[PDB]
Amino acid sequence: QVQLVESGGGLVQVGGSLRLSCVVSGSDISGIAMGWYRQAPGKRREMVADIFSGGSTDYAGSVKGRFTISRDNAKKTSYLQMNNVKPEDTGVYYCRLYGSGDYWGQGTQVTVSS
Amino acid sequence: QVQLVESGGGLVQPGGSLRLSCVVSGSDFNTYIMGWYRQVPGKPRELVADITTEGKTNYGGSVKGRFTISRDNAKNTVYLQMFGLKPEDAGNYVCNADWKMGAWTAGDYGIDYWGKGTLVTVS
Amino acid sequence: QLVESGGGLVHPGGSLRLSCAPSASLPSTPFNPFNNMVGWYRQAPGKQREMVASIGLRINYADSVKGRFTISRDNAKNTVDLQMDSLRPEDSATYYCHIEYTHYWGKGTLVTVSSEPK
Amino acid sequence: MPFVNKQFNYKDPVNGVDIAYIKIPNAGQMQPVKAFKIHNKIWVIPERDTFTNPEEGDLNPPPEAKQVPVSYYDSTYLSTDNEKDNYLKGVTKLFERIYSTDLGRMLLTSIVRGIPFWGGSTIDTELKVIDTNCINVIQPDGSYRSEELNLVIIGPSADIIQFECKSFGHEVLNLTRNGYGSTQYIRFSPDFTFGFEESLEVDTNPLLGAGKFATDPAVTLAHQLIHAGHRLYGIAINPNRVFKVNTNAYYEMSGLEVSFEELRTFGGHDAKFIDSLQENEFRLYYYNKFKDIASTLNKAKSIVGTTASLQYMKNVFKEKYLLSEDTSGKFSVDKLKFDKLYKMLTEIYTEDNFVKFFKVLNAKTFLNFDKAVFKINIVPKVNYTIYDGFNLRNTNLAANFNGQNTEINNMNFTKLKNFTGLFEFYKLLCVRGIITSALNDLCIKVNNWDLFFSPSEDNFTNDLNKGEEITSDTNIENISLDLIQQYYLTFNFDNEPENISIENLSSDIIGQLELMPNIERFPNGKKYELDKYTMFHYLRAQEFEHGKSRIALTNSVNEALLNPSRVYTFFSSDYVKKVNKATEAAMFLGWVEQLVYDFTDETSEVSTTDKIADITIIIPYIGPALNIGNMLYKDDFVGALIFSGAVILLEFIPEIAIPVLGTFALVSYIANKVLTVQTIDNALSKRNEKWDEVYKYIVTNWLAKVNTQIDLIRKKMKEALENQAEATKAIINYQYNQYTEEEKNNINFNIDDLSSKLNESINKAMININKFLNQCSVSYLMNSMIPYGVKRLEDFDASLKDALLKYIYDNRGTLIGQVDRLKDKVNNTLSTDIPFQLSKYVDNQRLLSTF
DSSP states (O other), X not given: OOEEEEEXXXXXXXXXXXXXXXXXXXXXXXXXXXXXXXXXXXXXXEEEEEEXXXXXXXXXXXXXXXXXXXXXXXXXXXXXXXXXXXXXXXXXXXXXXXXXXXXXXXXXXXXXXX | OOOEEEEOOOEEOTTOOEEEEEEEOSSOGGGOEEEEEEEOTTSOOEEEEEXXXXXXXXXXXXXXXXXXXXXXXGGTEEEEEXXXXXXXXXXXXEEXXXXXXXXXXXXXXXXOEEOOOEXXXXX | OEEEEOOEEEOTTOOEEEEEEEOTTSOOSSOOGGGSOEXXXXXXXTSOOEEEEEESSSEEEOTTTXXXXXXXXXXXXXXXXXXXXXXXXXXXXXXXXXXXXXSOBBOOEEEEEOOOOO | OOSSOSOOOTTSOOOSSSEEEEEOOBSSOOOOEEEEEEETTEEEEEEEOOSSOSSTTOOSOOSSOOSSSOXXXXXXXXOSHHHHHHHHHHHHHHHHHHHTSHHHHHHHHHHHHOOOOOBOOSBTTEEBOOGGGEEEEEOTTSOEEEEEOSEXXXXXXXXXXOOEEEEBOOSSOOTTTSSOOOOEEEEOOSSEEEEEOOOGGGTTOTTOOSSOEEOOHHHHHHHHHHHHHHHHTTOOOXXXXXXXXXXXXXXXXXXXXXXXXXXXXXXXXXXTTSOHXXXXXXXXXXXXXXXXXXXXXXXXXXXXSBSSOHHHHHHHHHHHTTOEEOTTOXXXXXXXXXXXXXXXXIIISOHHXXXXXXXXXXXXXXXXXXXXXXXXXXXXXXXXXXXXXXXXXXXTTSSTTGGGBTTTTGXXXXXXXXXXXXXXXXXXXXXXXXXXXXXXXXXXXXXXXXXXXXXXXXXXXXXXXXXXXXXXXXXXXXXOHHHHHHHHTTOOSSOOOOOOOBOOOOSSOBOOBOOOOOOOOOOXXXXXXXXXXXXXXXXXXXXXXXXXXXXXXXXXXXXXXXXXXXXXXXXXXXXXXXXXXXXXXXXXXXXXXXXXXXXXXXXXXXXEEEEETTEEEEOTTHHHHHTGGGOOSHHHHHHHHHHHXXXXXXXXXXXXXXXXXXXXXXXXXXXOHHHHHHHHHHHHHHHHHHHHXXXXXXXXXXXXXXXXXXXXXXHHHXXXXXXXXXXXXXXXXXXXXXXXXXXHHHSOBOHHHXXXXXXXXXXXXXXXXXXXXXXXXXXHIIIIIHHHHHHHHHHHHHHHHHHHHHHHHHTTTTTTTTHXXXXXXXXXXXXXXXXXXXGGTOOOHHHXXXX
């Protein structure tokens, strides 16, 4: 069955960089979009970056230029590179596989500190 | 269906005079916005004159007081008295029965009625 | 101009013969325009005019009319004729004679082709 | 029942309800503009759009010319009350025309239902409007009220015929593609339209008019409304998804930006340029986005900024997204309901389908580029009606799309200056001088959109080579007029969302248009040195410009390209000296009569053949007309076709890459008869799907890479024929005007008769040419593309046969009773090919009737 396992994650200093990773097992990733979401406490989960099978991407406006999403179809992996992190970036990050199911990673805390 | 049959068209000389008439079948005549349109080959119909259910009149820009449209509801007939005919008045004169359909007219849709027309030729 | 005759009313399956000749006001000097290629046309109300047949170097027929209409010249009588057999309702139209590639046209002859209504 | 249930005049007084000055989202501070609410959720602003975009405030031509085939500028258009009244009435009339079709009734109703989602809050228990999906409506007393809004029609920006769908973005949310949706602003004018060449429909209408046909602005508006539909449902395809082209070779365009969103929206063949893998990825993506909507509704506990209740707002979005809701109130996405909604929004709502309902003539593909701009006026009923458009019933405009023919219906069309110059964007193609004999190079400019569309290989993707796991469970998987009527019947008209009271926003609504991917300029004027005459040289050779002397035809391409008074023909030498000869007045009409005969004989020649797979006719003059296959002669062309087949027509040979097909891994259930048997059946069913997928992939590749090539050759064959007619006309006419105005009065010559005859002969030629080129296209598919597929499919069958027979043996214990039946099933099924039926993959009754 389908599992998304994330790794990486804050603490991280304001202005700092960090990478989150996720490996998918039980499915092939090829032909299926993936994305990263985040959820701060009390707030709605929000898309942060999307990446389609052919490499094309999408970003939330407020992370564009700072974050980079990537994927490896042979390795069934996605990663989210986070540069110049701000306090607004603090929260629980989830990787998602946009397949025919609810396919999420466990969620990994990223905490930006001054 | 409803029929429009026009008469009075012919060969006229510049300055000459013509009286067109059109009779309409059916019983809806008093409902119609009756109109006279001129059409030349390879060109669209163009309004010459029309007249509302109440008898209010409207004339194309080139008429300039030369023609008079009128209706007789009792005879289901509309008329166009024409004086001072000019070469640019030449054409197939086609009667039109139109009516309101809310925001639009039947013509705008357009499922309004048109006759075959009576030819007007200017010598 | 050109004068045309022969039109009329006939039953489907019936026959008519149209005939076209020049009038006295058709120019004759320095050329006789009528010696050139002549065609017969038809036009119904609200529809575009179309060629039915032409007679010149060749004889051409509208595909609808091929096998039913015959166009011919009579030199003695100075005419161009269109024999119309196996007439059908949709043939109904005003038919016009024409000198091909010119502004010479006849004013037309009416052809109606209907069954009597039961 | 009408869509616009009220007469609107621009000078009508304001009422603050459906006639009012309004303010829309704006980056700075916009002045109120008079607008009209022509239907619930839909406004019309008859102003030039100098508001939505801060940069675009000037209505003058740009510094650098825009990279489009046809553009038009006039800073004075739509500046007067009379023009704004005419604009309003035209737009309103076009909505009723769209609404008057079943398809438009549906689309317009989806649009009204597709309110932008209330995802304005950052708290995940709160529903809240997003500001930029609203407007401020000024009241007659000077106060204002704020209102939600789905759609606004506004006048165009600087480029009057740049029609597009715009939308205000969000700092975090990508509303047009995350399922939320946003208020859509369409730049559009009913006062102009495009002109295009068509030659396909000539078999049904042999009397089709010469020259350019005008696009029905109802089709154009419907197209933008399709976009607005996608965007309101937040399922638009990111514009960074483009069908990229190869631009390096001499025969290829310099550049072409066509978005996936546009291909989808066009429908027809265009939509099929997008392969299955990408197609399914989109669907799955949007499905999950809809799931997120259902989930945020499930955890919504409050609503702000309105007296409207929570259960009401939830229901509004249950209805928009066709969500299911169980008896406890938990919303979910039903897979089947989603699939139907997505299919309706993206495959039923297409330009192609609107063209069918309108029964108008239209470009059959985006690749048949617009060629001209026309001024129009569709408000007068004598010009255009809601039911017939330009093609007015019971008139000579009713048949053959005559109403759309800009020459036949010339009073309805004024051709305007295309602000894109003819060779603003071009390649310079040069036959090397030595080739022609040393003597100078023969260089011509070719307009960018006259060149070939050569799609990049990267547009085409597949996972044919991936293996999959067959299971006992494994899941076993067209748009007709009847299907559309079935979807029509699920619609409840009358039932729309209410216009609810919201709290007033700021006097100025702050808004920025959705960030767009920056696009690079194509390289321009690139020069190519070539070792042959191209199609483009042969075509240019057939042209002439304004001149004083008598044109002469020549059979030398070289001579014609060097002399402005000489025009190349592929017609016979006999034709050449007959048209070129001095002809005295008394022989003029017989001379004209003969040239028409000859023109007709040459252009309607057809050779039949029994020697080429799936090609039974040949048009031999196509060879010398375009220099096809670089063989300058009819005889060379006929023989080359029989020898090499349909490939000699192609500007480029397509790559068609079918890899070794992935192997089926069967799961063993060693304790269960039924499951083992189901697994074997599933493998067979999945195999049947594999053939289908392979065929469907190859069709996609064929349509985009091969059929587009033949399409252009067809267009150019028509241009060649027109060129021949115009040249013959110019010469005949020159000869006439050499006569005395006494000879001329007797010879009452009418060049209109001549043009009409030649057009008729051009139509008859195009009938044959289209049938021929149709055969070539399908023959290439059948003999040069599909076999690569079937070989791979037969390898796969063989491999699968071995696997299944092994599986049965390894499970013979479990399969006690059935071993021999299952062997037969497997052997029989995998012994014979699944035949390719073209009709399964395309619904073009044209390419189908060839097959």
